[PDB]
């Protein structure tokens, strides 16, 4: 159960391609989390 940045998820556990699932838009993000 892994998708890309444009994939879309509800939790970070979904991101397996070195992405971070933001709780804002509920979608994976590149460069991991954003500060």
Short mmCIF file of N, CA, C and O in Angstrom, two decimals:
data_model
loop_
_atom_site.label_atom_id
_atom_site.label_comp_id
_atom_site.label_asym_id
_atom_site.label_seq_id
_atom_site.Cartn_x
_atom_site.Cartn_y
_atom_site.Cartn_z
N UNK A 1 0.83 -1.20 0.00
CA UNK A 1 0.00 0.00 0.00
C UNK A 1 0.87 1.26 0.00
O UNK A 1 0.92 1.99 0.99
N UNK A 2 1.54 1.50 -1.12
CA UNK A 2 2.41 2.67 -1.25
C UNK A 2 2.13 3.40 -2.55
O UNK A 2 1.92 2.78 -3.59
N UNK A 3 2.15 4.73 -2.49
CA UNK A 3 1.91 5.55 -3.67
C UNK A 3 2.94 6.66 -3.79
O UNK A 3 3.76 6.86 -2.89
N UNK A 4 2.91 7.38 -4.91
CA UNK A 4 3.85 8.47 -5.14
C UNK A 4 3.32 9.78 -4.56
O UNK A 4 2.27 9.81 -3.92
N UNK A 5 4.06 10.86 -4.80
CA UNK A 5 3.67 12.18 -4.31
C UNK A 5 2.23 12.51 -4.71
O UNK A 5 1.42 12.92 -3.88
N UNK A 6 1.92 12.32 -5.99
CA UNK A 6 0.59 12.59 -6.50
C UNK A 6 -0.38 11.46 -6.14
O UNK A 6 -1.57 11.54 -6.41
N UNK A 7 0.16 10.41 -5.52
CA UNK A 7 -0.67 9.28 -5.14
C UNK A 7 -1.81 9.68 -4.23
O UNK A 7 -2.98 9.64 -4.63
N UNK A 8 -1.49 10.08 -3.00
CA UNK A 8 -2.51 10.48 -2.06
C UNK A 8 -2.71 9.47 -0.95
O UNK A 8 -2.86 8.27 -1.21
N UNK A 9 -2.70 9.94 0.29
CA UNK A 9 -2.88 9.07 1.45
C UNK A 9 -3.39 9.85 2.65
O UNK A 9 -3.60 11.06 2.57
N UNK A 10 -3.58 9.16 3.77
CA UNK A 10 -4.07 9.79 4.99
C UNK A 10 -2.99 9.80 6.06
O UNK A 10 -3.02 10.63 6.97
N UNK A 11 -2.05 8.88 5.95
CA UNK A 11 -0.96 8.78 6.92
C UNK A 11 0.39 8.69 6.21
O UNK A 11 0.46 8.36 5.03
N UNK A 12 1.46 8.97 6.95
CA UNK A 12 2.81 8.93 6.39
C UNK A 12 3.24 7.49 6.13
O UNK A 12 4.10 7.23 5.29
N UNK A 13 2.65 6.55 6.87
CA UNK A 13 2.98 5.14 6.72
C UNK A 13 2.71 4.67 5.30
O UNK A 13 3.27 3.67 4.85
N UNK A 14 1.85 5.39 4.59
CA UNK A 14 1.51 5.04 3.22
C UNK A 14 2.67 5.34 2.28
O UNK A 14 2.96 4.57 1.36
N UNK A 15 3.34 6.47 2.51
CA UNK A 15 4.47 6.87 1.68
C UNK A 15 5.65 5.92 1.88
O UNK A 15 6.21 5.82 2.97
N UNK A 16 6.03 5.23 0.81
CA UNK A 16 7.14 4.29 0.86
C UNK A 16 8.23 4.68 -0.14
O UNK A 16 9.32 4.11 -0.14
N UNK A 17 7.93 5.67 -0.98
CA UNK A 17 8.88 6.14 -1.97
C UNK A 17 9.66 7.34 -1.45
O UNK A 17 9.95 8.28 -2.20
N UNK A 18 10.00 7.31 -0.16
CA UNK A 18 10.74 8.40 0.46
C UNK A 18 9.94 9.70 0.43
O UNK A 18 10.48 10.78 0.20
N UNK A 19 8.63 9.58 0.66
CA UNK A 19 7.75 10.75 0.67
C UNK A 19 7.09 10.92 2.03
O UNK A 19 7.09 10.01 2.86
N UNK A 20 6.53 12.11 2.26
CA UNK A 20 5.87 12.41 3.53
C UNK A 20 4.41 12.80 3.30
O UNK A 20 4.13 13.80 2.63
N UNK A 21 3.50 12.02 3.85
CA UNK A 21 2.07 12.28 3.71
C UNK A 21 1.64 13.45 4.59
O UNK A 21 1.54 13.31 5.81
N UNK A 22 1.40 14.60 3.97
CA UNK A 22 0.99 15.79 4.71
C UNK A 22 -0.48 15.69 5.12
O UNK A 22 -1.33 15.32 4.32
N UNK A 23 -0.76 16.02 6.37
CA UNK A 23 -2.12 15.97 6.90
C UNK A 23 -2.94 17.15 6.39
O UNK A 23 -4.14 17.23 6.63
N UNK A 24 -2.28 18.07 5.70
CA UNK A 24 -2.95 19.25 5.16
C UNK A 24 -3.75 18.90 3.91
O UNK A 24 -4.97 19.10 3.87
N UNK A 25 -3.07 18.38 2.90
CA UNK A 25 -3.72 18.00 1.65
C UNK A 25 -3.95 16.49 1.59
O UNK A 25 -4.64 15.99 0.70
N UNK A 26 -3.37 15.77 2.55
CA UNK A 26 -3.51 14.32 2.60
C UNK A 26 -2.89 13.66 1.38
O UNK A 26 -3.53 12.86 0.70
N UNK A 27 -1.64 14.01 1.10
CA UNK A 27 -0.93 13.45 -0.04
C UNK A 27 0.58 13.42 0.21
O UNK A 27 1.12 14.31 0.87
N UNK A 28 1.24 12.40 -0.32
CA UNK A 28 2.68 12.26 -0.15
C UNK A 28 3.41 13.52 -0.60
O UNK A 28 2.90 14.30 -1.40
N UNK A 29 4.61 13.72 -0.07
CA UNK A 29 5.42 14.89 -0.41
C UNK A 29 6.89 14.52 -0.56
O UNK A 29 7.41 13.69 0.19
N UNK A 30 7.56 15.14 -1.52
CA UNK A 30 8.97 14.88 -1.76
C UNK A 30 9.84 15.55 -0.70
O UNK A 30 9.37 16.40 0.05
N UNK A 31 11.11 15.15 -0.65
CA UNK A 31 12.04 15.71 0.32
C UNK A 31 11.52 15.53 1.75
O UNK A 31 11.79 16.34 2.63
N UNK A 32 10.78 14.44 1.96
CA UNK A 32 10.24 14.17 3.28
C UNK A 32 9.36 15.29 3.79
O UNK A 32 8.79 16.05 3.01
N UNK A 33 9.25 15.40 5.11
CA UNK A 33 8.43 16.44 5.73
C UNK A 33 9.01 17.82 5.46
O UNK A 33 10.18 17.96 5.13
N UNK A 34 8.17 18.84 5.60
CA UNK A 34 8.59 20.22 5.37
C UNK A 34 8.49 21.04 6.65
O UNK A 34 7.44 21.08 7.29
N UNK A 35 9.58 21.70 7.01
CA UNK A 35 9.62 22.52 8.21
C UNK A 35 9.12 23.93 7.93
O UNK A 35 9.86 24.90 8.05
#
